[PDB]
Amino acid sequence: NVPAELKYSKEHEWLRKEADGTYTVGITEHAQELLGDMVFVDLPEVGATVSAGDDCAVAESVKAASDIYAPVSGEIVAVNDALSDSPELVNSEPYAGGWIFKIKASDESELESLLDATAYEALLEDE
Amino acid sequence: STLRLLISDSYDPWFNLAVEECIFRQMPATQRVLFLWRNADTVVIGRAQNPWKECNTRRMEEDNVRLARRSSGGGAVFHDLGNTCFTFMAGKPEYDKTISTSIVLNALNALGVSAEASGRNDLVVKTVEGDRKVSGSAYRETKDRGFHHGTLLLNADLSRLANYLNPDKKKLAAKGITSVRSRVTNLTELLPGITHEQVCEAITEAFFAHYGERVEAEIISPNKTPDLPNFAETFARQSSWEWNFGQAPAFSHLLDERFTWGGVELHFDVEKGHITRAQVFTDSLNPAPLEALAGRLQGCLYRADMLQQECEALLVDFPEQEKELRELSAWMAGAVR
Ligand SMILES: CCCCCCCCOP(=O)(O)OC[C@H]1O[C@@H](n2cnc3c(N)ncnc32)[C@H](O)[C@@H]1O
């Protein structure tokens, strides 16, 4: 299980190119299984300039306070303040309702150097 | 020589929390780091905790008991010199909570104390009148790192602990993590005269046995800055009301009071420490100034001084009620303390 239409990163995040040129971000199934039952998601500041590889949110699961990084630099568009009420959504719907935030990719030369779907499992059978 | 041993001779929680992170961030990829430290009269809370809800911030302030929000998650715990802190740091994919957990349980055994891990975050011992929690743990993990820090109740003041962790009966509706209440006890009735430097040796020895090597301990002085990189900046942040109190997840506060002139109730929506919107309901024959306050009170800092500022700055507009707005500010300042 790894939505073939989505791009992925080293830190186990999934990006979805939104028609309106924007970008939705969340954590991969595999990742949210390792973490654990989510109890609170620390969302990044709404309207914040972030860089790729930069920690922009902290996931607190019964198991630990885990770091979540932004795969691509840019402007913090929106945040799923639906999680600030149902953090479990990150476990149940890692790709659906468990979406963390959206963004605008300031410099899109970063997409070039990422991993596709099939390139994710290849990473999973090691890391 | 990939193990590192750090001992903080400072009891400033802000100092100590700054140090923990720095080490943690600038930590080499193949080390295993043990950090021993404790904090004088302090209340330490997890990332997403509402301080005003999880501890008695008013009592805390009256006795200058320090508040410090930590990078890890978890509930609110109390620290005096009777509380010993331990942090285990190790890179991935080697990092494993359970490994450091047993190392600590090992140290306890070596001293003669027998405790079993409980739940996901606790260390307890058996006793005549039930079970007793003697430890509490929280964890933070990044992409490449991870650290497990926890507390050992040696000879702490349990009544002060109980005191500050028992918050005022405020009307709060808040997101964030709430504290899980256990019954605690001191390791002192299992091992009389137990000191900090005693428990330190234990945990150091077990730690040394596990990874089968040793290294001279490095002592971090309290009076003077650690050469660790990026410090001043972290310390300054760790010490900031913006972080300790400000990081509070959205919550609302309902406060009320009878004034011989009428009843006042105030609703506050709070976000990153600032009142995003306030409302007033009152049977006063003079709503004018109060209804004006609720508006003017936007963006204000959820704190006594600012609240009292916006008040005095209101007198200058409604002098016919200087007396009342005087009591108001007076009551309002303590109510949020
Ligand atoms: C630098 C180490 C920080 C580790 C903090 C652990 C977080 C604990 O949160 P919980 O909700 O699990 O615990 C709350 C519960 O713990 C008891 N308690 C207060 N102070 C304690 C100390 N110093 N050690 C152990 N246990 C403590 C209280 O019952 C509190 O309600």
How many Å apart are CA A35 and CA A26, to the nearest integer?
13
Nearest to B123 by CA among B105, B141, B109, B98: B105
Chain A: give the shortest CA distance to residue B97, in Å: 10
- B93 shares a domain with B26: yes
Structural domains counted in chain A: 1
Residue numbers of A between 9 and 68 with CB closer than 8 Å to B: 10-11, 39-40, 42, 55, 58, 60, 62-67
On whether the CB atoms of residues B23 and B33 are closer than 8 A, the answer is yes
Which of the 8 DSSP states describes residue A45?
A: P
Q: B121 CA to middle of ligand 1, Å?
A: 9
Residue B76 is labelled as binding a ligand: yes
Same domain, B230 and B320: no
Residue that is written with structure tokens 């030369």 in the block:
A109
CATH of the domain at B265: 3.30.390.50
Using DSSP, state whether B231 is helix, strand or coil: helix
Residue A8 structure tokens: 């992925």
A36: left (phi over 0), alpha (psi -120 to 50) or beta: left
Count of CA atoms in the C-beta half-sphere (13 A) of A93:
11
Residues B323 and B207 in one domain: no
- Domains held by chain B: number: 2
Enclosing H/E stretch for A91: helix A89-92
Amino acid at B328: L
Final residue belonging to a domain, choices B200, B223, B248 = B248
Residue closest via CA to ligand 1's atom 30 equals B181
Same domain assignment for residues B266 and B276:
yes
φ, ψ of residue B286 to 5 degrees: the values are -140, 80
* Cα torsion B288, B289, B291, B295: sign: positive
Give nearest CA residue, ligand 1 atom 8: B75
How far from A63 is each of A35, B70, B98, B145, CA to CA, in Å?
A: 6, 16, 12, 15
What's the domain range around A16? 1-127
Distance CA B307, CA B298 (A): 11
Amino acid at site A6:
L
- Asked if B210 and B321 sit in the same domain, the reply is no
Q: Looking at chain B, list the stretches that DSSP marks H as alpha helix, in order from N- to C-terminal side.
A: 13-25, 51-54, 57-62, 97-111, 158-164, 196-210, 231-238, 241, 288-296, 304-315, 322-335
Q: Is B193 annotated to bind ligand?
A: no
For every residue of B92-112, DSSP letters joined together read TTT--HHHHHHHHHHHHHHHT
State whether B52 and B197 are in the same domain. yes
What is the DSSP code (8-state) at residue B178? P
| Same domain, residue pair B238 and B265 | no
In whole angstroms, how far apart are CA B137 and each of A23, A63, A64, A88, B98? 37, 11, 10, 22, 11
Residues B224 and B288 grouped into a single domain: no
> Of B230, B248, B266, which one is at a domain's C-terminal end?
B248
d(CA A115, CA A120): 7
* Domain of residue B62, CATH code: 3.30.930.10
Strand partners, A102: A24
Nearest Cβ partner of B72 from A10, A40, A65?
A65
Residue B162 and residue B278 share a domain: no
How does strand A99-105 pair with strand A23-27? Answer: antiparallel
Q: Which two tokens stand for residue A37?
A: 């039952």
B224, B248, B272: which is the final residue of a domain?
A: B248
Cα separation, B282 vs B321, in Å, equals 15
Range(s) of the domain holding residue B334: 249-337
What CATH number is attached to the domain comprising A111? 2.40.50.100
